[PDB]
Design a protein around this nucleic acid. Structure first.
Ligand code: MG
Ligand code: MG
Ligand code: MG
Ligand code: MG
Ligand code: MG
Ligand code: MG
Ligand code: MG
Ligand code: MG
Ligand code: MG
Ligand code: MG
Ligand code: MG
Ligand code: MG
Ligand code: MG
Ligand code: MG
Ligand code: MG
Ligand code: ZN
Lengths: 82, 56, 51, 151
RNA sequence: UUAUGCUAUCAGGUGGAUGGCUCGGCUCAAGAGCUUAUGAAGGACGUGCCAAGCUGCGAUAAGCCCGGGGUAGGUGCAUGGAGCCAAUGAACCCGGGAUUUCCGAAUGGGACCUCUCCGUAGUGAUCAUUCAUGAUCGGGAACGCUCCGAAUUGAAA
RNA sequence: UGGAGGACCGUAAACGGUAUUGAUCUGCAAAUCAUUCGUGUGACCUGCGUCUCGUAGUGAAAUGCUAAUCUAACCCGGCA
RNA sequence: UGUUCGGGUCGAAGCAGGGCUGUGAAGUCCUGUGGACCGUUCACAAACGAAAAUCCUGGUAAUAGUAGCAGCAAAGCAGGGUGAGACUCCCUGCCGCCGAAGGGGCCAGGUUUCCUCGGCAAUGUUCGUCAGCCGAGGGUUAGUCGGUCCUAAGACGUACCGUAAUUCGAGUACGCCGAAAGGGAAACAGGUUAAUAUUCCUGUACCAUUUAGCGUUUAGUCUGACGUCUCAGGGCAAGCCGAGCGGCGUCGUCGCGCCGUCUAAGCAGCGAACCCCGUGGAGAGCCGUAAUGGCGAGAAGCGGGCGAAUCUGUAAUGGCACAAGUCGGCUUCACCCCGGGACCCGUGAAAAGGACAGCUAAAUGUCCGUACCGAGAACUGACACAGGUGCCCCUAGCUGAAAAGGCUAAGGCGUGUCGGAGUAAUUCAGUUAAGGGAAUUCGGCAAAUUAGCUCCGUAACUUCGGGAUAAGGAGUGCCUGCUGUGUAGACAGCAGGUCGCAGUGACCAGGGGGCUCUAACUGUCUAAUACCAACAUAGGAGAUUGCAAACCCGUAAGGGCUAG
RNA sequence: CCCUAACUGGAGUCCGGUGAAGCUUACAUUCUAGUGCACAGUCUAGAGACCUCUAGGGGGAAGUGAAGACCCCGUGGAGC
RNA sequence: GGUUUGAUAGAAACGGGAUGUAAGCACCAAGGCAACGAGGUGUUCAGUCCGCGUUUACUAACCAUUCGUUCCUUUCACUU
């Protein structure tokens, strides 16, 4: 029952890669603490806060602001978003 | 002011919400009972012999 | 700005994505025998039985 | 040209003006058609192609001339008075200003010693009762019945 | 070259009757006949590479595993593009398991909120007992048993 | 001076609905529009919430209103 | 159907027309089309024969290329584009509508209508390249805004009790819910996108809980926390005026007109009224307020304490074309603070939370909503509906009492989504009409008159309150120069000159009076033909009942009246 | 009102686009009289009438809307 | 009705008419120390305007077009 589905990529979601942020599609039943813990378990990078929102398509989009610099770019390269 | 189309624009509120037990919009918001399945009034489902015809 | 809880917005989300046409390949695969479904609707009509 | 209405709406939301205060250049319409983002509209606004037209506010020179004449006392006769005497000037405000002037004059007279307590109390009650019409009337009655301590 | 028209036929349009077919329905007969706190039925939401409805399934989500049958194709109603699965025997059918979100008898408190609050992690209510543990709660096409119980109507009122 | 009143005038604030028996009457509208009108500091108007209902409720009482339905609503059943 | 005899891709059924037979029901045959079943002998069954039921379902006419696309907001034209196609889409200019709502903010509701791109078969009262449509993609980020928490009217649950019985029922005890407009711990300025923003970014902050270090309770109070009317004082948004400075407009002559000249929370400081404390000693009375008032049961005066809105300083670098960016004054609502008075046979909520013992550090602050419309096109009324929901809360300059009406800003629009044309009758709504002036008509129905303000003056009758704006009259503009009150805004008044048919020059805005009937009055009423003399009302009178009552509900448990 | 007139804006008339509905057994160019269930465009006897189109307001079609709500009947109801 | 062998409609000018003496400038103006100043007089029976006429081809009434042939046929009185 993983909280993470996949990184969310649109023109606006790739507008935050320069800002160290990375927006994910997660499980709508999850909370901010579960998303933070599961992202830190999945990649090891430390997260500073979680900006969650639920969309009209029935999904939940989470924006994780990392603490270490370039963690968003590293995760994007490891997933192949960039 | 009339009873027809004049006072039918005051229909900006509800008296029945979508009931949990049956997913039908029949849960009264004041008596706390669904008028289709009877959730909030009884454990069993409301079903009456007058909901169909006499079988003869 | 009606103030929905989580379940009300979820029901409206499902109602929104139900209101889309059939895909083109379904019509092509079915020999054009499946061209619509009953859940087509327009927002300026009969209101949703959702909330 | 394409629909420049989206360009005009973006220019209105970037310039902080109304939708019809925006002046798009009719000559350089292709350039305004190119403007698809707010940075494009900002560049066009700073180069002069898209500008916000001036506000044509209500002039007031004739109003100021009429106000100066009214301040002098003219343009205010009985043919221009349309509201009830009591709305143009309320009665309670007239009493307030009159009694405050009278009480202040009596207070200053009692302060500088020209009016002792025995006659100051009577004059205060007289001003309460409406015997005087103004500070000048109070002064003239004082100098007629000689209520000051002249020495 | 007599228009607007009238009647009969013919050709065509609109239309969907008749005819033909039919995986549906109805009726009768014969078997078999309970399920649910080990959390049902029913519902909400999710669930497909392109998937809107229905159906199936439940974050392992048109599926997973094991024994038997079948064996060459499979990838639902619904033989489209591109892939995937299958001779390590799939698909499919029978049997036995796993997973089985939220509500619902719904049962830790709460519902105009199918979600929300406390988390000290949940046996709610009524009961039996050796206070170990256990029972009842809901659903089922009609039938069965107990109790309560009209009027139309007929008598040509 | 004072600021009382189920006081007065008054709005296309709000509420009501007089007369034109005007417009409209297969309408903008299954009762609305225009002009003309009544109340407009109170027995006032009104949002939201909650409660009272079928031989029952509510009614400053017309048998009015109780979802375009009222001298007994509506839905299904007795009912072919 | 049983049974006998059969027909058919060398073309069955059905369908349109026609020949023949039959009194006829109908049968058979031929022409055309068709692509798979169809009859007959003797008997037997039926969901077995339609021309009709204001019959039922479907298809389709005539009306008819007619009514509507008009009345409540009469709105478009030139040039240039795009496009195959332009009154209708885009830009520019000109001319216009709303401008106390048709603008701005948001509740309920809608539910993606939001934003970009591509189309015009349907939707749009025309067309359309346009679109709230069609198709595709994207968009909503919170410790500080709300919900969440609290309790109110009042619901719901468990137990008891009742009931033939319950999913049914009043009460009691324990709980739990009940407000996106009541109470409430805290965040502001600027930037950024196509659409998000007190949420994201920059800067500067603040609140809560828990953990640790340093010590204490004052612990019972206060606050939360209260109606209606009226009013004083203080502040402030908005508004307005003068000087300087920077742009735009006008420029026939003039030197004016418009825009801007900005600066948040947080932090630090002062504190007006009221109240309290220490002194004080006031009567042939004194101190006050707008007003009521206060005083030996202790006034004035002098000190002190508690104590607001705002203001000042910082935040000082943000945005402004890095263009100025500095100053003075007036006013200030309907917004905030504070205080007084009056009224009640109305007495105008409760609880959570908060203050009194906190200071420093660190970490944590989950969940939901957040797009967009909020209405003459996003809600509701079948609709892109002249209704209703919302005029629910705000709204600038001039005139003016004014938020009325008229004219203009800002802002929104030319979509209260058909155009050309100027040629009858008739029609909806208006303007004017000689002489007469209700002769019209059931009836002055409709229309007309008058209308603002100041001053003079005002009858019958009366419950002494009124009638009353009774009635009947005069003045009113503009310019020159002044006066008085006020601290001031502003208000009031005077002299002279002068134009016109007309000075509340438009807009705005009572016609008046007399005699009866009826009801006292304000109010209520047949939503959708009756706004009345009907209903209610205060006033009057009668009746029951001493409370385990009278009256009433329930089958009962037990209840309303009754926290009487 | 005598007694109507002129003018304005919107309709109407004409034009381009869009575009329904209601009456209807059939035929139908009628007028007079008679007859007929005694109120006829269709019968009988006469008289008129070439057809088509446009505008007009409504004489007739006992014009359309509608199983009369007045009266009676029903061993029909309801309320009081 | 007229149509270049022409005054049919329009312009220009004039005649005949409607209103009432335009803007700017000069002087005067009750006054005000001044700045200003409603307004009066002269230029001015002015200015503005005419869905009426005359003179005038200055522009536009030009360029065409179709019927009076059934229509193809050589059912012909034709012309390759
Ligand atoms: Mg959130
Ligand atoms: Mg039965
Ligand atoms: Mg009987
Ligand atoms: Mg009034
Ligand atoms: Mg009704
Ligand atoms: Mg029945
Ligand atoms: Mg038939
Ligand atoms: Mg027209
Ligand atoms: Mg206006
Ligand atoms: Mg169209
Ligand atoms: Mg609550
Ligand atoms: Mg009365
Ligand atoms: Mg009475
Ligand atoms: Mg009948
Ligand atoms: Mg009988
Ligand atoms: Zn239900």
């Amino acid at each position: 029952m993983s909280s993470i589905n996949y990184p969310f990529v649109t023109e606006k979601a790739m507008m935050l890669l320069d800002e160290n942020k990375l927006q994910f599609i997660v499980d709508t039943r999850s909370n901010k603490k579960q998303i933070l813990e599961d992202v830190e378990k999945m990649y090891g990078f430390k997260v500073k806060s979680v900006r969650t929102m639920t969309t009209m398509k029935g999904m939940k989009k989470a924006v994780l602001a990392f603490e270490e610099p370039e963690a968003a770019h590293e995760i994007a390269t490891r997933i192949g978003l960039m | 002011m009339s009873k027809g189309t004049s006072s039918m624009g005051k229909r900006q509120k509800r008296t029945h919400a979508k009931c949990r037990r049956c997913g039908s919009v029949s849960f009264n918001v004041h008596t706390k009972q669904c008028t289709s399945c009877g959730f909030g009034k009884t454990s069993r489902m409301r079903t009456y012999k007058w909901q169909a015809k006499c079988k003869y | 700005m009606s103030h929905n809880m989580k379940g009300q917005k979820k029901r409206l989300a499902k109602a929104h994505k139900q209101n889309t046409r059939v895909p083109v390949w379904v019509i092509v695969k079915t020999n054009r025998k499946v061209v619509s479904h009953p859940r087509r609707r327009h927002w300026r009509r009969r209101s949703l039985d959702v909330k | 040209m394409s629909d420049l209405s989206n360009q005009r709406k973006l220019a209105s939301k970037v310039l902080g003006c109304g939708l019809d205060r925006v002046w798009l250049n009719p000559e350089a319409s292709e350039e305004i058609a190119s403007a698809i983002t707010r940075e494009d509209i900002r560049g066009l606004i700073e180069e002069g192609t898209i500008k916000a037209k001036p506000v044509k506010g209500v002039s007031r020179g004739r109003a100021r001339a009429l106000a100066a004449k009214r301040k002098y006392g003219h343009c205010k006769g009985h043919g221009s008075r349309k509201g009830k005497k009591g709305a143009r000037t309320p009665k309670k405000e007239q009493w307030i200003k009159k009694i405050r002037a009278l009480r202040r004059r009596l207070k200053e007279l009692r302060a500088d010693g020209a009016l002792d307590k025995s006659v100051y109390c009577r004059l205060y009650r007289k001003a309460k009762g409406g015997e005087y019409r103004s500070v000048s009337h109070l002064n003239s009655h004082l100098e007629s019945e000689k209520l000051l301590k002249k020495e």
